[PDB]
A = this chain, B = another copy of it.
């Protein structure tokens, strides 16, 4: 299984893009343990958000996470060309288990 993410999203340089991540009451809707990751092609993933809305040290405030219902979202503001990347979500889902989304490719226009 997988969390549902749109294939694609886009926003303007300097503006924002928002990505959704839809699960169920047993994952996204059940806990406050949603993370987001950014990956450029061929590069290492990077954690952007954890615990729904927390940014790791060194991740700036232009990355914001939220959730409501069974859907989490990530908004990337102040868009830079280097924000063109794949973005994935994950959620805790009970036990010691996590489920991931299928990734959204962002284009920066």
Could you tell me the distance in whole angstroms from the C-beta of A45 to the nearest C-beta in chain B?
Answer: 21
A108 at the interface (CB under 8 A from B): no
Q: How many residues of A contact B (CB 8 A)?
A: 27
**B contact residues around A66 at 8 Å (CB):** 66-68, 71-73
**Cα–Cα, bound, A72→B73 (Å):** 10
Are the C-beta atoms of A71 and B18 separated by less than 8 Å?
A: yes
Are the C-beta atoms of B16 and A4 separated by less than 8 Å?
A: yes
Q: Which of A6, A12, A71 has the most CB of B within 10 A?
A: A71
User: Contact residues of A with B, CB < 8 Å?
Assistant: 4, 6, 9, 11-12, 15-20, 22, 53, 61-62, 64-73, 75, 77
